[PDB]
Ligand binder design. Structure first.
Ligand code: K
Ligand code: K
Ligand code: K
Ligand code: K
Ligand code: K
Ligand code: K
Ligand code: K
Ligand code: MG
Ligand code: MG
Ligand code: MG
Ligand code: MG
Ligand code: MG
Ligand code: MG
Ligand code: MG
Ligand code: MG
Ligand code: MG
Lengths: 82, 177, 114, 80
RNA sequence: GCGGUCGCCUCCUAAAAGGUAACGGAGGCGCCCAAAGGUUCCCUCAGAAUGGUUGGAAAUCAUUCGAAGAGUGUAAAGGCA
RNA sequence: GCGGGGUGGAGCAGUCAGGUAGCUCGUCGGGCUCAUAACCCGAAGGUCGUAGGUUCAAAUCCUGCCCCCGCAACCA
RNA sequence: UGGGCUACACACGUGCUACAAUGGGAAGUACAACGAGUCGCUAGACCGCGAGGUCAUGCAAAUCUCUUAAAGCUUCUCUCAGUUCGGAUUGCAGGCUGCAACUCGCCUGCAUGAAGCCGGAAUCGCUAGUAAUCGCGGAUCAGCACGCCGCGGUGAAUACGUUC
């Protein structure tokens, strides 16, 4: 996977936005196109609207979700069945 | 005799003090223990019932009574009087010995054991423990069992209230959740 | 026997150990190396003391219902959080990126000609 | 108690192999190994490895580490 | 004429003894049991509530309530705890 | 009211005489063919109308019930 | 910018790996050819179980390297087992390339160990260094092939005959 020396990855703009909202009593939805961003404890407790190709699907972060990419929690394509 | 000694010595004074009984006669005690093994597979093959009966007899030390369907039910392919399910009754010393072994040995051997329920009370001070599988009792030998099976162990006490029954069972040793 | 599983008798000790869940061939070699027991001897030929030493190593290891609970917990964790992988597990589809247009029979199950 | 119909029942002692907790109780199973006991008596001994005392739930303390948080996994992973 | 019926048992008709008709209203019988007979001893049900692995409305188990709401080979009436 | 029937998609056995669910066509899939047909190879499709009894066992015996078909429902 | 071309009740084509003992596994030992290499091929050493990492060496090359090829041969073990066959799927933990590996890369270790017991009707390639089988290099290419192109190793059976 992602090599250890490299650290995590998180788009700087997304990381900056979450850090700005850190000092907040109540969190506001963060609209992002950054599928690549990795989830952080700072991300915990927020609602992030991740772009899924055509619209920003909201996702509530939690300590269970940490350690994964945001895009994985926003399915791209819909398949109801046949 | 260990559990009987434990009861009479520790439990009886403790319950007397806790519940402020005027006379010692009021002390709740385990009247009997009825272990029931419900075998619906007997209809398909009576040998299933025979193996279940053999397992129960080995576990309990007494020959079980082979209960029979009081009614004929088409839903279960059941005809009235078919020998489905067995039970054993234990009182006094045998009751105490089996209860002590259940508390100590068999319960830990249960898969992913986190204790026993704390709500399986009829509302009159009588409890029942639903064993999901055998092989927890050392007498089973973990190998003879071709098909795994469960059972229901009903502990009947003289306790008037679920509270008194819970106290007695806990003192005798019961890993409630 | 060792971890509650009756490993084969006539087989060699390494292979009989592999029959335990949560233990592969490499792990079997490592535990036997720690215990000092030769890998060629059959489990029937193993002495009681060697068997007990093997038991201590295995107990130190994590296997059987413990490992099964752990893996099920991980899979359940994915499904509950609603990950893409969790939905893959829920719908019985390849989770590691394979293509589902063909193949995928291992996850999907037997073919339905409909 | 009826005769010749009940499974052979005998007193037997159990010892927790891990902790050594002892208790005497009846059983259908018999053990070739026999041990002494207070009151100057001997009974077959059925050794057991797991008992109430050994089992974690009765103790109230858990042997498992309870797993790790994912961020903590990541902390150890990338030294962060 | 056609259809239905022809002997025996039970109920209602039947008018609180008995009996009482109609091509009046309803059902059964042409057996069964070697125990489903006799006797001695012993026992009490159906359902419900609650708790309990398979097990689900409902299999078997336990406490309580529960005078019959069951059962009585076989129709109904009468009777039987 | 008198009969005849309810089994796979359709048509039919099996029912009498209790043990085990079939034949034909048809359908789905794959072959052959330039392609279709014919042909060849696989597969599916009913718990036997339905509910109760009899039995160790019911598609089969018994009872009722629901459906569909034909006839009748009045004569000098 | 992000997503899709990577979907997935299904049908077909083309391949790879298998179903095992003419084999799996462990150790030792032998023999190639075609090609590629500048911020590229990388020696040697050290670290790491491994993928690889660090230091560092030679070579714009019949000079150094990729590159001691694998089948093979010799021992030891396995004893016909859905297994010490099989290597899918899955969990974990990692190595790389890249700004970035969730959709959606390759690879490594541990763990798990799926179907599969030689395949119906039918159907394909091949007449000799060929079929079969074993590796190796290359173009594309930051990274990524069971594909394609090329190279060599070992190396058969059969052809009566032209009715169909
Ligand atoms: K895919
Ligand atoms: K395909
Ligand atoms: K095609
Ligand atoms: K291929
Ligand atoms: K070999
Ligand atoms: K990717
Ligand atoms: K490449
Ligand atoms: Mg294993
Ligand atoms: Mg892919
Ligand atoms: Mg009168
Ligand atoms: Mg009168
Ligand atoms: Mg009578
Ligand atoms: Mg674009
Ligand atoms: Mg494409
Ligand atoms: Mg084989
Ligand atoms: Mg030619």
């Amino acid at each position: 996977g992602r090599s250890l020396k490299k650290g995590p990855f998180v788009d700087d703009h997304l990381m900056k936005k979450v850090e700005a909202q850190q000092g907040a009593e109540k969190k506001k939805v963060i609209k992002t196109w950054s599928r690549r961003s990795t989830i952080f404890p700072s991300f915990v407790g927020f609602t992030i609207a991740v772009y899924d190709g055509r619209k920003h699907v909201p996702v509530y972060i939690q300590e269970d979700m940490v350690g994964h990419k945001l895009g994985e929690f926003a399915p791209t394509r819909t398949y109801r069945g046949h | 005799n260990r559990l009987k000694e434990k009861y009479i010595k520790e439990v009886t004074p403790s319950l007397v003090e806790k519940f402020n009984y005027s006379s010692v006669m009021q002390t709740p005690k385990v009247d009997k223990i009825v272990i029931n093994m419900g075998v619906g597979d007997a209809v398909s093959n009576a040998k299933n019932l025979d193996k279940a009966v053999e397992e129960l007899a080995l576990i309990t030390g007494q020959k079980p009574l082979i209960t029979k369907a009081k009614k004929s039910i088409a839903g279960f392919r059941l005809r009235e009087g078919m020998p489905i399910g067995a039970k054993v009754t234990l009182r006094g010393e045998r009751m105490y010995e089996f209860l002590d072994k259940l508390v100590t040995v068999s319960l830990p051997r249960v898969r992913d054991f986190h204790g026993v329920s704390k709500k399986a009370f009829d509302g009159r001070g009588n409890y029942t423990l639903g064993i999901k599988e055998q092989l927890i009792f050392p007498e089973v030998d973990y190998d003879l069992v071709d098909k795994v099976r469960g059972m229901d162990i009903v502990i009947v006490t003289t306790a008037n209230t679920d509270e008194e029954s819970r106290e007695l069972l806990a003192q005798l040793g019961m890993p409630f959740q | 026997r060792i971890a509650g599983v009756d490993i084969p008798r006539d087989k060699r000790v390494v292979v009989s150990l592999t029959y335990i869940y949560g233990i592969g061939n490499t792990t079997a070699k490592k535990v036997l190396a720690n215990v000092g027991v030769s890998e060629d001897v059959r489990v029937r030929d193993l002495t009681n003391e060697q068997t007990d030493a093997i038991r201590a190593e295995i107990d130190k290891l994590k296997v059987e219902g413990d490992l099964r609970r752990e893996v099920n917990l991980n899979i359940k964790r994915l499904m509950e959080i609603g990950s893409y992988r969790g939905i893959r597990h829920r719908r019985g589809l390849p989770t590691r990126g394979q293509n589902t247009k063909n193949n995928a029979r291992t996850r999907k199950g037997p073919t339905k000609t409909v | 108690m009826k005769q010749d119909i009940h499974p052979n029942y005998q007193p037997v002692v159990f010892m927790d192999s891990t902790t050594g907790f002892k208790f005497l109780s009846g059983s259908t199973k018999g053990s070739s190994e026999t041990v002494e006991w207070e009151d100057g008596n001997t009974y077959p001994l059925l050794r057991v490895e797991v008992t109430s005392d050994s089992h974690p739930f009765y103790t109230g303390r858990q042997k498992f580490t309870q797993a790790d948080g994912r961020v903590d996994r990541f902390n150890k992973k990338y030294g962060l």
